[PDB]
Write a protein that binds this ligand. Structure first.
Ligand SMILES: O=C(O)[C@@H]1O[C@@H](O[C@H]2[C@H](O)[C@@H](NS(=O)(=O)O)[C@@H](O[C@H]3[C@H](O)[C@@H](OS(=O)(=O)O)[C@H](O[C@H]4[C@H](O)[C@@H](NS(=O)(=O)O)[C@@H](O)O[C@@H]4COS(=O)(=O)O)O[C@H]3C(=O)O)O[C@@H]2COS(=O)(=O)O)[C@H](OS(=O)(=O)O)[C@@H](O)[C@@H]1O
Lengths: 189, 189, 189, 189, 189, 189
C-alpha cells in the first residue's frame, strides 16, 4: 500500500559576525530525522500517518535568506553532500573552505541569495562502518516507522564565509517519503 | 491529494426465535456513518486519517453466519437497497416480506449461508426532501470529514424469516472511501 | 553449487474456549527459523544438508483444522504478513481484529476450514532498525548456515475469533530454500 | 529429485625398486566403492548426502607423480579398463605388459608424467557371471545407497614398468554420481 | 568522481617441512584490508589517495614460487574462495584437503608452480550473521575510506600439501579498487 | 594513468580609494602556481595527489564582488591574457587603460558586478626568451610534479578604474588539470 507524499519543516540558522579580517569560513552539519517531520499520533495508532514502513526518496534543503539585498561584505561558500555521518568538524572561523573541492560542491552566494540542494539521503545503519547503498529506486531499503526512535538520515554539510554583519537564514527542509502497509487500527468507542 | 483506501467494521445481529407457526419476517434497517470506521485522532489533527474531504464510493455488507450447517427450520429473506432514509418500519414478526418485490432485492438464504451486497450509498443531505444523486464517479459530491458530527449514509434494508431457533450473524461492513487534501499539522515538540 | 529444495515441519496451535459473550479475537505471532527444519549433522559436517550458505525463498503456512464440520459458533479472523518482528501484542480476548485492515490480510474462516499463506519472509538483521529488502530473486542476500545460531525469519501474524469450543489446528510450515557451496568433508575411517 | 555432483578421494601407490635387469612390469588392480567417497551421516540420516538411490556416471583416475623430472631409468606402461572384476593377477615383476594389446590401453609414461583415465564404471552385480550393461545414460541402473554395504564398482587395471628407483604416485579418484529421491528426515529436538 | 586504480602488496608464506610420512595438508587463511595497500597521508588529508568512499571490485592473489624446478616430493593442493570469515581451522598437518570438494576449488600444483586466483571479495559487515551481496557492479556497496580502522575483506583459503623440504612463496595481492568523491583539502602555507 | 580533476583557491584583492579627480586606473598582474593549490603529502609520498605528471588545461578566474549594489562612483575596466610573465608595470593611478586595445580584452563593469575569464595559461620555461606553444590538447607538454619547486604559470593582467570608495573583491581561481602515471608507494607499518 504505497503512498508517496511530502513533509516539510522550517527552522533557523545564523552565522554570527566576526572581527577577523581574513576570509574565514563557518562549518556546520545537517542531519535529517523523520521525528521532526512526522509527529506522534494518538491512541492505538502511534504515529499520525498510519503506515508501517518508510523510505526517504529525496530531500530538498532550501536556504531562504533573511538579509536585505543591500547588505555588503558579501562572500562565497560551499554545500556538499555527506552520506556517512563523518562531517568536517564544526568550526567558527576556519582559514579555508573544506567543502570546496568536493565533487558534490555547489557554490553558496551570500548573504541575500537563495540556495537549494536536492538529493537522496542515506540512513545511518552502522556508524562504525558507515555503509550505504547507491541510488536505486527499486532496491532501496524499507525502514520501520518507529514510535519515538527513528534513525537519523544524513547528507548535507555547509561552509559559510563569515562577515562583519550577522547572516541569518530560514532553512526549509522538505522530505519526499514513500510509505507502505497502511495499518490503521479502529477500536470501538 | 487523492487517497483511495478501505475501512472495515464488524458487529452482530440476531433474529430471535418465535413460537409463531406462520411464516413471518423480521424487518430491520442499516445505516452507515464514517465515525464508526474512522476514530478520532490526536492533537492538532482531529481525525486519524489526515484528510479534509471524503466521499464514500462503495460499501460491502457481509452477513457472515454464526449458525451450523445442520440447523433446520430454514427460511428465505430479502435484502434491498434504500437510498433515502425511509425504511419499512422495524417489525418482529410481519406476515410478509416487504423487500421481496423491490428491484434491488437479493434473496437471503437462511440461516447458515453467506450474503453479500455491494453498492454505492448516498448521504442524507435533507431528510425532509430526501434527494440523492445518481451514480457518477466524476460528479459525486465531496463531503467534509467532520470531527464528531459526520452525516449518515444509507442504503440497506433487510427482511429475515423467523425460526424456532435463534439466527445469529456477524456483519462486516467495508467502506471504500476516497479522501482529498492531505492536511497534516506538524507543531514543534 | 545451487540446490533448491523443500523442508517441512508440523506442530499444533489451539485457541482455548472463552465464556465471553462478545466477539473477541485471539492474537498470536509466528516466526520461522531453519534450526527447526534442518537438524544438526554428524562429524566434520555440522549440519545434515552439506552446504555453506542459504536464503529462504518462500514459506507456505498451512492451518490444517482438527475440528469437525459440524462444529458451531463459527467465526472469522485474519492472517497478515509482518516482515519486521514487531507484531501486535499477544492477546487472549481482544475486542477487535487488529490484522483486518492490513493490506496483506486474508480472511480465516473458522473452525473447520483450511487456510494457506504463501509469501517470502525476511530475516531479522537488526531488530533495532528493522530493515528488510524488497522481493528480488537476483538480489536476495545469502546468509550463512550456522551450526546452532541461525537467525529468525519473520512474516506471519494471526487473529482468531474465540468460541465456546476449543479450536485446534495442526500447522504445517514448508520452507522453500536455496543453498550454495556444497562443502562436504570426507575424512578417512 | 536428481542431484548430479562430484566426489573425490586421494591415496598413494608406490612401485618399489627391483635389482632385476630385464624390463619387467608391476601389475595391480583398482576398484571403486562409494563408501570411500561418502562418509556415514548422523542420526536418522544414515549417510551424509541425503538421498536414496545413486548411479555412478563417470570416474576420473589421475596418477599425479611424486618423482622429479630428473629421475632416470624411465619406462612405459599401460592402463586398461576392466569392467568385470577379473583382472590380470597381481605381479611384482612380470616379463611382459599384459594390458598392452587391450583395446582400452593408454600408454603410461613413467615416472614423472601425469596419466588420466575418464570412463564409465560398472557395478559387480554377479561376480559368478560377471554381466554388465553398455553405456546408456537413460537406461543405467539405479542402485541403492546402502548404509555400510555398498557394492564395488570396477574398471581399471594398470601395468607399471619397474625401475632401480622407487616410483611413487598420489592417485586422485573423482566419481561423478547422480542421486535420486531426497529423503531427509527431520525429527524434533 | 570515480577513479578506478590498482594497488599491490607483496609478502611471504612458507610451508615448513614435516617428517610425517602420510599425505597431510597445511591449512591457512587470507584476508584483505586496504590499510595494508593504502598508507596514511599527511596533513589535512588523512590518506594518501584523496577520496572519501571506496569499494573493492576484484583481487588477484598470485603465489609466486621461491623453489627450484628440480625440487622433489611434489604435491597437490587447493585454493577456495571463502566470502564469510569462517575458514577451516588453521592446521599444520591435516589428514585431508578440506577445500577439495569446494565449488570454487582450483588445484595448486606444488612447489615450483604459479597459482593465481581472481575474484570479487566481500566485506565483513556483521561477523555474527555473515551476510554478503552477490556480484553486481551497479549495486555494490560503497564503504568509507577510514583513517586507521577500515574493515577486513575476505575471500581466500588454501590447503598446501606438506613435504620433506620447505616450500616458500612470495604472495603478491593486487586489489582493483574504485574510489569516489575527490576530497582534497588545500590550506594555505 | 590519466586523471582529470578540478582544484580551486580563494583570496582577496582590494582597490584603495583615490582623491584624484581624473579617471585613473590601477594595474596588477596575476600568476598561477600549483603549489598554492596542491599541499604537500606525507611520508614517502611528497604530494597529497599521487601522480608524477601534470599539464594545466584551463583556468577560471572569478571576481566575486564584496560590495553592495547601491555603491556609486561606478567605473569600468579591462582584463587581458598575457602569456610571458612580462606584464604592464604595476601602477596605482595611471592616466589610461593599457589593457583596453588588447585583442583578448573583456570589459569589466565595476564595482558590484561579476567578471570571469576562461582560458589556457602557459608555463614559464625561459623568462629570457618567453616562448610557448599554441593551444593544442594533443601536443601540450607534460611537466613534472616537483616537491617544492614547481614552475609559475601565467595568463592574466588587469586594470581597474579607481574610485572614492574602496573596492574589495573575493577572487576564486579554479584549475582544470590532468595528471598521469599513478605513483603511489606502500611501505609496511
Ligand atoms: O626606475 C624606476 O622606476 C624605479 O622605481 C622604483 O623602484 C621600486 C619598484 O617600482 C617597486 N615596485 S612597483 O610595483 O613597480 O611599485 C618595488 O619593487 C619591489 C616589489 O616587491 C616588487 O615590485 S613589482 O613591480 O614586482 O610589484 C618586486 O618584487 C620581485 C623582485 O624584484 C624580483 N627580483 S628582481 O630581479 O626583479 O629584483 C623577484 O624576486 O620577484 C619579486 C616578487 O615579485 S612578485 O611579482 O611579487 O612575485 O621588486 C621589488 C624590488 O625590486 O625591490 O620597489 C622598487 C625599489 O624601490 S624601493 O622599494 O626601494 O622604494 C623606485 O621609485 S619609487 O617609485 O619607489 O619611488 C626607484 O628605484 C626608481 O624610480
Amino acid at each position: 500500500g504505497i503512498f508517496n507524499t511530502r513533509l516539510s519543516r522550517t527552522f533557523g540558522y545564523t552565522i554570527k559576525r566576526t572581527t577577523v579580517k581574513t576570509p574565514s569560513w563557518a562549518v556546520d552539519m545537517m542531519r535529517f530525522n523523520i521525528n521532526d517531520f512526522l509527529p506522534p499520533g494518538g491512541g492505538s495508532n502511534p504515529r499520525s500517518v498510519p503506515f508501517e514502513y518508510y523510505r526517504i526518496r529525496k530531500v530538498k534543503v532550501e536556504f531562504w535568506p533573511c538579509s536585505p539585498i543591500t547588505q555588503g561584505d558579501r562572500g562565497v561558500g560551499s554545500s556538499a553532500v555527506i552520506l556517512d555521518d563523518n562531517f568536517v568538524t564544526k568550526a567558527t572561523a576556519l582559514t579555508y573552505d573544506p567543502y570546496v573541492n568536493y565533487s558534490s560542491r555547489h557554490t553558496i552566494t551570500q548573504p541575500f541569495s537563495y540556495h537549494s540542494r536536492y538529493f537522496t539521503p542515506k540512513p545511518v545503519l552502522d556508524s562504525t562502518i558507515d555503509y550505504f547503498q547507491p541510488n536505486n529506486k527499486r532496491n532501496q531499503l524499507w525502514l520501520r516507522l518507529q514510535t519515538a526512535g527513528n534513525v537519523d538520515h544524513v547528507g548535507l554539510g555547509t561552509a559559510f564565509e563569515n562577515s562583519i554583519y550577522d547572516q541569518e537564514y530560514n532553512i526549509r527542509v522538505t522530505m519526499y517519503v514513500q510509505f507502505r502497509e497502511f495499518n490503521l487500527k479502529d477500536p470501538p468507542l
